[PDB]
């Protein structure tokens, strides 16, 4: 990746956007006619929240990761006014929207998503990138309907003692992160359990009307299963959600889970 870019190299298409501060557009590189996505950040209000470092941590990390289940960052550039991210384009949109449409996923689609998820996380963790942000909004779908992890901004190098003032809900964060303690790869396995629950139920297991009561339910790990959640699903989710990070299973055990292997296409 020697080549450096400019807006004049791209034709801007449909807004996919309003993208976590400023939007994501379909775009086509003029010479190759290569279709991709452009994330656009005005840079004044990225500066004003002092995220300028966290953004280039996202850029650096997501740059060196090559996995079929991880969204590519090809490069980036800037002019005086703002900063641009050149990203792999995921044609089928966000998992979040698919979940709004179906309202919940069956066991086969869910198990497949989890499998793809664990695979990408195995890869991330081998490099000791831990995502820590995993949620349906950060998940994209490729042309074959395969899951793709995006938005690595909050991702870190393990272990982390990090301060990192918290934003998005509390819903996907485990007790060790919300209580401000040391944490490791096991963070992502908790998020995986939260995600698996949400996929099948249509709602995250600790969901509540206030930030403060969500904190409570996460700390005390209080969640209940609707009747239609099968025994094998409950088992995997119950294993994933454990106050003690060390009681959480390895991604390998997840991939070898009888409920996973039964319903997974993969
Ligand atoms: O709605 C559609 O038609 C649609 C079709 C194809 C898409 N595919 C796509 N491809 C690459 C990046 C990207 N970003 C986002 C765009 C909109 C909303 C959220 C994100 C995002 C997701 C994860 C992390 C960061 C940003 N979206 C996206 C939407």
Beta partners for 77?
84
Catalytic status, residue 133 = yes
Ligand 1: residue whose CA is nearest its atom 5? 93
Please indicate whether residue 155, judged by its CB atom, sits closer than 6 Å to ligand 1: no
Which domains are present in the chain? 5-93 (3.30.200.20), 94-266 (1.10.510.10)
Contact 254, 236 (CB under 8 A): yes
What phi and psi values does residue 232 have, to the nearest 5 degrees? -70, -30
Other beta carbons within 10 angstroms of residue 143's beta carbon come to: 9
List Cβ neighbours of 83 (8 Å cut-off, separation of 6 or more).
40, 41, 43, 46, 55, 76, 77
Please indicate whether residue 93, judged by its CB atom, sits closer than 6 Å to ligand 1: yes
Q: Please, what is the end-to-end C-alpha distance for the chain in angstroms?
A: 32
Ligand 1 pocket test, candidate residues 14, 19, 86, most atoms within 8 A of CB: 19
Quick one: how far is CA 64 from the chain centroid? 17
Resolution to one decimal, Å: 2.5
Separation CA 182–CA 176 (nearest Å): 7
C-alpha dihedral (152, 158, 176, 201), degrees to nearest 10: 40
């Amino acid at each position: 990746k020697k080549r450096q870019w400019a807006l004049e190299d791209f034709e801007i298409g449909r807004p996919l956007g309003k993208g976590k501060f400023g939007n994501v557009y379909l775009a086509r590189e003029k010479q190759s006619k290569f279709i991709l996505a452009l994330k656009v950040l005005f840079k004044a209000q990225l500066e004003k929240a002092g995220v300028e470092h966290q953004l280039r941590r996202e850029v650096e990390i997501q740059s060196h990761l090559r996995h079929p289940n991880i969204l590519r960052l090809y490069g980036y550039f800037h002019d005086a006014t703002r900063v641009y991210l050149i990203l792999e384009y995921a044609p089928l949109g966000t998992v979040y929207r698919e979940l709004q449409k179906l309202s919940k996923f069956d066991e086969q689609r869910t198990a497949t998503y989890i499998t793809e998820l664990a695979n990408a996380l195995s890869y991330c963790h081998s490099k000791r990138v831990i995502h820590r942000d995993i949620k349906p909004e950060n998940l994209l779908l490729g042309s074959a309907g395969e899951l793709k992890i995006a938005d690595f901004g909050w991702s870190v190098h393990a272990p982390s003692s990090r301060r990192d003032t918290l934003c998005g809900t509390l819903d996907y964060l485990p007790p060790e992160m919300i209580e401000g303690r040391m944490h490791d790869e096991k963070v992502d396995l908790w998020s995986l359990g939260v995600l698996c629950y949400e996929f099948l139920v249509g709602k995250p297991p600790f969901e509540a009307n206030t930030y403060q009561e969500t904190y409570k339910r996460i700390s005390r790990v209080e969640f209940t299963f609707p009747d239609f959640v099968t025994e094998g699903a409950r088992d995997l989710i119950s294993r994933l959600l454990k106050h003690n990070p060390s009681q959480r299973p390895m991604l390998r055990e997840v991939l070898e889970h009888p409920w996973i292997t039964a319903n997974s296409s993969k």
